[PDB]
Scaffold this active site. Structure first.
Site, PDB file in Angstrom:
ATOM      1  N   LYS B 228       0.878  -1.188   0.000  1.00  0.00           N
ATOM      2  CA  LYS B 228       0.000   0.000   0.000  1.00  0.00           C
ATOM      3  C   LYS B 228       0.906   1.226   0.000  1.00  0.00           C
ATOM      4  O   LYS B 228       1.884   1.249   0.753  1.00  0.00           O
ATOM      5  CB  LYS B 228      -0.959   0.031   1.195  1.00  0.00           C
ATOM      6  CG  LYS B 228      -1.991   1.148   1.147  1.00  0.00           C
ATOM      7  CD  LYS B 228      -3.310   0.782   1.784  1.00  0.00           C
ATOM      8  CE  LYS B 228      -3.181   0.465   3.256  1.00  0.00           C
ATOM      9  NZ  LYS B 228      -4.447   0.727   3.977  1.00  0.00           N
ATOM     10  N   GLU B 288     -18.911  -7.060   9.578  1.00  0.00           N
ATOM     11  CA  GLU B 288     -19.932  -6.431  10.449  1.00  0.00           C
ATOM     12  C   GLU B 288     -20.874  -7.490  11.042  1.00  0.00           C
ATOM     13  O   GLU B 288     -21.298  -7.320  12.185  1.00  0.00           O
ATOM     14  CB  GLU B 288     -20.702  -5.394   9.630  1.00  0.00           C
ATOM     15  CG  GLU B 288     -19.923  -4.115   9.374  1.00  0.00           C
ATOM     16  CD  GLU B 288     -18.992  -4.136   8.173  1.00  0.00           C
ATOM     17  OE1 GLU B 288     -18.889  -5.178   7.511  1.00  0.00           O
ATOM     18  OE2 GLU B 288     -18.374  -3.102   7.912  1.00  0.00           O
ATOM     19  N   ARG B 316     -25.232  -4.204   6.895  1.00  0.00           N
ATOM     20  CA  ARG B 316     -24.849  -5.630   6.721  1.00  0.00           C
ATOM     21  C   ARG B 316     -25.209  -6.453   7.955  1.00  0.00           C
ATOM     22  O   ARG B 316     -25.310  -7.672   7.830  1.00  0.00           O
ATOM     23  CB  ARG B 316     -23.336  -5.740   6.513  1.00  0.00           C
ATOM     24  CG  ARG B 316     -22.853  -5.295   5.141  1.00  0.00           C
ATOM     25  CD  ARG B 316     -23.053  -6.371   4.094  1.00  0.00           C
ATOM     26  NE  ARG B 316     -22.637  -5.936   2.769  1.00  0.00           N
ATOM     27  CZ  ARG B 316     -21.413  -6.057   2.263  1.00  0.00           C
ATOM     28  NH1 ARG B 316     -20.437  -6.609   2.962  1.00  0.00           N
ATOM     29  NH2 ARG B 316     -21.167  -5.618   1.043  1.00  0.00           N
TER      30      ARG B 316
END
Ligand SMILES: CCCCOP(=O)(O)[C@](C)(O)c1sc(CCOP(=O)(O)OP(=O)(O)O)c(C)[n+]1Cc1cnc(C)nc1N
Ligand SMILES: CCCCOP(=O)(O)[C@](C)(O)c1sc(CCOP(=O)(O)OP(=O)(O)O)c(C)[n+]1Cc1cnc(C)nc1N
Ligand SMILES: [Mg+2]
Ligand SMILES: [Mg+2]
Lengths: 549, 548
Positions: B228, B288, B316
């Site tokens: 990243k 979640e 979710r």
């Protein structure tokens, strides 16, 4: 007679293997005769007789929590925990629940029947026992092969695998011979794997469970069972059949129609569809999320998917309906059977949330058939909506007898108008299968001099021009719905009128926003006052109070 | 000049040398830094997929081969290579380039939702459609980050994909490890062919792996390891800070408080909590569902979990809130940051569903703080609810000065009352972040001779006795909320009044039930007429119609 001597799990402790074989045979005879009388999940419970014996011979419930995924297969667990004398009342009002119940026993932890959640409870419980410093508590999650196809299991296994906290994952696999289970391998996930174990060899199950406990960290014990083991049999026109026939009829002419079920082709009426169109039926497992998002993909490929999922289970796909289907304006039709009160399977089965949940979805079109002809028409109308999601919702049981409308006014069916000499006093907006009850209410009120228009809006959402036009012609609007009142159809009608500057008083006659104990559908509705007698009484009082303050 | 300006579409990569693709990658990185650095866009995730995206468009023929990005925040290089490199001055601005793929922008873009872990499910459906319609040789490619791979949808989709030879290529973009946020479970031996690990910054090696997958004739996982922020060392007075500080203060005294995040400890303010109580913070991945149900298990073990999930992503977990937490009457507190309009991330990020979704939950208690002190206060009240779920919801950005009440009646805070000499014309029920707007509306109406009571109900759900008691004293009730109108706070107030036989006219001034394009929060609100000027005008009209 050994079953009668089992006061609790410890009474298994010193039984010989021969005695355990005799006991398991007594347990099957009990299940076959008790469950045949009350109804219930005979096959799944026959499959876990030896597994449940082994669990209660190796683990010390509830110090070691035994968590059943889905929970429909815990009858033997209940028989071994002091409740064998309670099965005459199984699944009856005031009787033994069809699922574990914390109020019935300290041995019961999870009451939700929604599948694939046990491992997530198990992770949290293991974390809690570490945080509170409880010594030597072994969480055991019993997970069927079908439940293992749900995404919740993957999230939980990933979290469990990050810790040495002991969770024992017992996979109760009856989708294979020693079917509906995972296509993915779970032998090589990074978690210790034991098996496959013959789940009807009681001592082999104990040996595997003991090895798992000794390992002292997460371990998968893969047990193979036979659904209905020991009972060959296991080993009135309904709404579902009307849906099945109508869908086949439309799909014969439209090759773009495909059908999706989350592990329930038979109950949803899609088995016959797949027999006619085998390449257009998809069973995605107990995976309502994937059902809806794979439907979005099919629609992006030019098709019009029909996703049949029982109302209560659609809760799992809320965000997929919102961000994958609706956001992309995709033509996916959802068919919610078992909508409204189902009763016997308790709070986690009643389809009382769909009108409230679907109402949050921007632009959604939702229909509630009042009878067979309207199920057939509204399904056709839904299949003709090509720019966004549609849904049909209807209850379990006998299809409603046809009720032809007096007239259609801006999409709304007028089922009854005030009789001569009576005025337009009450607009009774009958949602779905409550049309007959609304007509009976209108007749009672007629006898009291109160003029009632009964309408079936057909397409409940969005609230139509026809409802707003008729609302202004009446003095009181009452919506009658087989759905929770919070965010339900009645609240949506009220909201639409107020947005249109129409302040006719509205009342929301539906299901209170509560979790209901098990009982028959008619018993639940009667206890809630959802009867034509009680509803008419309430409306009488509202009418008499008009202008009194 | 440079090569990037010459790339009209993917085929212009086809005849580049390896040296040229290397120069092009460096030009792309310099471009990304120029146009995204310090703007709030996703610089790091995009720097990580420069070579991967070049390789994807060198091997696959988009959109005949659909390239589906999971989450979609890492598709900037994809857009640069599909005709949109001249559009980045407008990135994430109203009327400009979306921060996520957009079907209206390009035939090369498929999925617009930013909610993670869904790409493989789209891919299964698309592969199935191509088979049913007789399309030859369409290879569906799903680019799934290691974080996204921790979500349950991926397992459902991989299970289904593995049942068929239909070609789906699963490209795992893994930056949680070195050649962390990714799965703890192995995905080398699932029954699906596995290729890798591949060095995701070795563009040639990525192409070699992708070509092997493309010709395999069955589903294949290609595991690519990226860094990243590759190439940019820096990538290699807030509501949230108030929540963070308040939670730590309560947990110092309460050892039973635990905190859970779904892969966002930093953005939710929980990093500082874990630093003080490292055994009491759990990061469950982008999961979640597991966050909520493991919270249920923790509560079943005697603890009081605090689950901090941004409002939109809580969708979710609806069924787990309902059947795992609420059904069992368990004391789990949900903290929903980024509630209300967030703006720049577009339709799938605005936190405009939570009051409507939570209102379906039997017995739920939901608070909407109006300021820092009320966040602190209502969090403490939530932590003291021991018999069922609680929720707090509050917006992104800075929290202004405390808004003092004139008095508290039945838990409701009276923020303003009609001036002496004015009638009690309007009860303005101001939810959460809209208290300042409501006070401004009330001042405008005061100047017009219209008397307004402004209340913050604090605990919006259930609707309180105080709201019912004040409503009967006014001619009009207006609820002002930073939430969708369908099933929102206004409709809940109306429903509660009508259940109590109170037919005072109610109006629901909230967000229309629509998906909004990206823009600033203030721009979205202004476009909707959610300004004190516009709302005062609407209320003036309603009051004129009632008379008195
Ligand atoms: C008589 C009326 C009783 C209705 O109740 P039902 O429909 O029998 C039940 C229990 O509910 C089940 S079991 C099951 C397969 C278990 O398969 P599996 O885990 O392998 O168990 P097995 O029986 O083989 O031992 C499925 C699919 N459902 C429905 C269901 C669907 N979706 C979700 C999220 N959760 C559910 N719970
Ligand atoms: C400044 C405003 C910008 C907000 O946008 P965000 O918050 O950056 C974003 C894109 O949204 C993400 S990315 C991400 C990790 C991806 O991890 P991974 O897949 O590995 O990607 P990579 O490492 O390449 O970045 C997570 C957790 N979220 C939030 C999120 C949470 N829950 C769900 C269901 N879906 C989400 N989408
Ligand atoms: Mg099974
Ligand atoms: Mg990553």
């Amino acid at each position: 007679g050994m079953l009668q001597q089992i006061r609790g799990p410890a009474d298994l402790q010193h039984l010989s293997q021969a005695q355990l074989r005799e006991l398991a045979a007594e347990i099957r005879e009990f299940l076959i005769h008790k469950v045949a009388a009350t109804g219930g999940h005979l096959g799944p419970n026959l499959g876990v007789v030896e597994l449940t014996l082994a669990l209660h011979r190796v683990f010390d419930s509830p110090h070691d929590p035994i968590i059943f995924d889905t929970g429909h297969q815990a009858y033997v667990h209940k028989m071994l925990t002091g409740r064998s004398q309670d099965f005459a009342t199984l699944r009856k009002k005031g009787g033994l629940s069809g699922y574990p119940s914390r109020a019935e026993s300290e041995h019961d932890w999870v009451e939700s029947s929604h599948a694939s959640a046990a491992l997530s409870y198990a992770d949290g419980l293991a974390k809690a026992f570490e945080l509170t410093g409880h010594r030597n508590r072994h969480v055991v999650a019993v997970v069927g092969d079908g439940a293992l196809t749900g995404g919740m299991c993957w999230e939980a296994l990933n979290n469990i695998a990050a810790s040495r906290r002991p969770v024992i994952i017992v996979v109760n696999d009856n989708g294979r011979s020693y079917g509906g289970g995972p296509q993915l391998l779970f032998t090589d996930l990074g978690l210790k794997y034991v098996g496959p174990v013959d789940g009807h060899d009681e001592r082999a199950v104990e040996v595997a469970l003991r090895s798992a406990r000794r390992f002292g960290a997460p371990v998968i014990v893969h047990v193979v069972t036979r659904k209905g083991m020991g009972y060959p049999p296991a080993e009135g026109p309904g709404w579902t059949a009307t849906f099945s026939d109508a869908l086949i009829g439309y799909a014969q002419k439209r090759r773009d129609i495909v059908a999706i079920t989350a592990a329930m082709p038979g109950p949803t009426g899609l088995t016959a569809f797949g027999q006619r169109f085998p390449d257009r039926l998809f069973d995605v497992g107990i995976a309502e999320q994937h059902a809806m998002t794979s439907a979005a993909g099919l629609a992006m490929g030019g098709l019009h998917p029909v996703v049949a999922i029982y109302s209560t289970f659609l809760n799992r796909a809320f965000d997929q309906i919102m961000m994958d289907v609706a956001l992309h304006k995709l033509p996916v039709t959802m068919v919610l059977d078992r909508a409204g009160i189902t009763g016997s399977d308790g709070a986690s089965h009643n389809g009382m949330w769909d009108l409230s949940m679907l109402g949050i979805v921007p632009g959604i079109r939702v229909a509630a058939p009042r009878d067979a002809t309207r199920l057939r028409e509204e399904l056709g109308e839904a299949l003709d909506v090509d720019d966004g999601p549609t849904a049909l919702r209807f209850p379990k049981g006998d299809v409603g007898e046809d009720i032809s409308a007096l007239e259609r006014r801006g999409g709304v069916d007028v089922l009854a108008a005030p009789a001569d000499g009576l005025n337009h006093d009450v607009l009774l907006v009958a949602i779905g299968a409550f049309a007959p009850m609304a007509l009976a209410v209108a007749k009672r009120l007629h006898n009291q001099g109160i003029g009632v228009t009964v309408i079936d809006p057909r397409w409940v959402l969005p609230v139509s021009d026809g409802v707003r036009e008729l609302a202004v012609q009446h003095k009181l609007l009452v919506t009658l719905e087989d759905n929770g009142v919070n965010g339900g159809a009645g609240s949506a009608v009220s909201a639409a009128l107020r947005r249109a500057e129409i302040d006719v008083p509205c009342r929301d006659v539906g299901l209170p926003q509560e979790f209901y104990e098990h009982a028959s559908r008619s018993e639940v509705l009667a206890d809630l006052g959802l009867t034509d007698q009680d509803v008419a009484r309430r409306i009488t009082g509202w009418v008499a109070a008009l202008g009194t303050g």
